[PDB]
């Protein structure tokens, strides 16, 4: 996020980090319950990647994080990689997340939910802060 | 990328107004936000765009794409969750 600010640790409990076996953060995702994570299809996640829950500072050795293995990758068959349309992938965890104060679910809208232009929302992540 | 989790508030735009920046690349299962002095960027992909509805944070978008330079003046493009939630509910029910 360019121009963002540091979050209060544990305040976005559904935010997870997708890291490869190397320990490299490459994408974010959101827990929708303890066994499922929603992320983008363009992230190109495989079952060798890990979902890290409860993390705030990726450089800390003292945070009680949960490294969760992925059982199956569900890429929306409607995803069009040429247009980057319907960019959603569900990840079924082989090992369920343990919900706590720092790990919980985000709500999903009804297909009929209205989110008006001008509404201030929030986005979070460990992406580049400067490009 | 940063060690610690970053956050940023940003406004949603209408797809019509967003097409002024991206033209026809803006499809129906997409929602734009930003062009407000902040921008999602590489490494943020897959992450959430949440809006508070009736007191609870709900997933409105998924960081999808945008400016190759993460220009804080161009709007970012997110997967519109409202157009994909039926697929999610179907996948979770079958697995």
């Amino acid at each position: 996020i360019v121009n963002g600010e540091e979050a209060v640790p544990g305040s976005w409990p559904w935010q997870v980090s997708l890291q490869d076996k190397t320990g490299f953060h490459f994408c974010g995702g959101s827990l929708i319950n303890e066994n499922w994570v929603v992320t983008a299809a363009h992230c190109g996640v495989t079952t060798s990647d890990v979902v890290v829950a409860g993390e705030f500072d990726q450089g800390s050795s003292s945070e009680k994080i949960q490294k969760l293995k992925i059982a199956k990758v569900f890429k929306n068959s409607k995803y069009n990689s040429l247009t980057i349309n319907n960019d959603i992938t569900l990840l079924k965890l082989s090992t369920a997340a343990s919900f706590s104060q720092t790990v919980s679910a985000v709500c999903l809208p009804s297909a009929s939910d209205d989110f008006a232009a001008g509404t201030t929302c929030v986005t979070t992540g460990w992406g580049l802060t400067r490009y | 990328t940063p060690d610690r989790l970053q956050q940023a508030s940003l406004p949603l735009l209408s797809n019509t107004n967003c097409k002024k920046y991206w033209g026809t690349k803006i499809k129906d299962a997409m929602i734009c936000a930003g062009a407000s002095g902040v921008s999602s960027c590489m490494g943020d992909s897959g992450g959430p765009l949440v809006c508070k509805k009736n007191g609870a944070w709900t997933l409105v978008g998924i960081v999808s794409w945008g400016s190759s330079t993460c220009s804080t003046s161009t709007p970012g493009v997110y997967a519109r969750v409202t157009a994909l939630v039926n697929w999610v509910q179907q996948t979770l029910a079958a697995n």
Partner: peptide, 10 residues
């Protein structure tokens, strides 16, 4: 869902 135990401060 959607209500963190640790309130985000924006």
């Amino acid at each position: 869902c959607g209500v963190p135990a640790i309130q985000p401060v924006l």
